[PDB]
A paper describes a structure:
Saccharomyces cerevisiae prevents uncontrolled retrotransposition of Ty1 subfamilies using distinct mechanisms: canonical Ty1 is inhibited by a self-encoded restriction factor, p22/p18, whereas Ty1’ is inhibited by an endogenized restriction factor, Drt2. The minimal inhibitory fragment of both restriction factors (p18m and Drt2m) is a conserved C-terminal capsid domain. Although the crystal structures of p18m and Drt2m are similar, three divergent residues found in a conserved hydrophobic interface direct restriction specificity. Structural and genetic analyses of p18m reveal that p18m and Ty1 Gag interact through a hydrophobic region that is shared between both proteins, termed the Dimer-1 interface. These observations suggest a lattice-poisoning model of restriction by p18m in which the CTD binds full-length Gag and forms dead-end intermediates in VLP assembly.
Given that Ty1’ CA and Drt2 also encode p18-like domains and to understand if they had the same Dimer-1 properties as p18m, we expressed Drt2m and the equivalent residues in Ty1’ CA-CTD (Gag coordinates M259-Q351) and determined their crystal structures. The asymmetric unit of wildtype and Ty1’ CA-CTD (F323S) crystals both contain two monomers arranged through a single Dimer-1 interface and the Drt2m(SS) crystals contain four Drt2m(SS) monomers arranged as two dimer-pairs through Dimer-1 interfaces. Inspection of the structures reveals all helical domains with arrangements and packing resembling that of Dimer-1 observed in p18m and confirm that the F323S mutation does not alter interactions at the Dimer-1 interface. Taken together, these structures show that p18m, Ty1’ CA-CTD and Drt2m collectively share the same Dimer-1 interface responsible for restriction in the Ty1c system. All residues forming this interface are conserved apart from determinant residues 266, 270 and 312 that are AVL in Ty1c Gag and p18m and VTF in both Ty1’ Gag and Drt2m. By contrast, in Drt2m and Ty1’ CA-CTD, it is the V266 sidechain on helix α1 that closely packs against F312 on helix α3 and because of the greater steric bulk of the V and F residues the distance between the V266 and F312 Cα atoms is increased to 6.8 Å. Concurrent with the increased spacing in the VTF interface of Drt2m and Ty1’ CA-CTD, the side chain of the conserved residue R315 can adopt a rotamer that allows it to swing in and hydrogen bond with T270 which is not possible with V270 in p18m. We solved the crystal structures of Drt2m and the Ty1’ CA-CTD and find a highly similar structure to p18m.
Residue numbers in the entry:
A (entry chain A): 261 to 329, 331 to 351
B (entry chain B): 262 to 352
Write the structure that this text describes.
């Protein structure tokens, strides 16, 4: 709590996702972290946030990284794709 | 175009135990904090100090023990202590 920023940044920098947990829940936790960082004066823009998320994608989700080498893609757009892929894996 | 991600990753994974010059450590940490700021991500004194302290090992861990909740310590103050310790370690 004293170290909220450091912990949130660390989490953002070490994200891993390959569809082993629900896409919704992953999305919710990443949104929460991005929102809290912003509220604590550390602005993570769409590009930087997308890069942190993309770099943690493994399994089939790595192909989303390969596909979006996408100028002006939003977190929302990336999360849409992730959810789509997750739904297809069920 | 991944400069911010790289710089934040560096900041989050710092390591210093006196095996390299304190000056060089300080220079690289300053460089990263400056470049982040220039790329619209200012990192305040507290957060910067926490990242540096967390990376201290060997005898430098004792600086973290002494200062973990040292309210309103500056990066400059922390760097001073690290440099002092380094100078004392030199033969």
């Amino acid at each position: 709590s004293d170290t909220q920023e450091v912990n949130d940044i660390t989490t953002l920098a070490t994200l891993h996702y390959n569809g082993s947990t629900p896409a919704d829940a992953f999305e919710a936790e990443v949104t929460n972290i991005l929102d809290r960082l912003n509220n604590n004066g550390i602005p993570i823009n769409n590009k930087v946030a997308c890069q942190f998320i993309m770099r943690g994608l493994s399994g089939e989700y790595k192909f989303l990284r390969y596909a979006r080498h996408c100028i002006h893609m939003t977190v929302a757009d990336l999360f849409s794709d992730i959810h789509s892929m997750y739904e297809e894996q069920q």
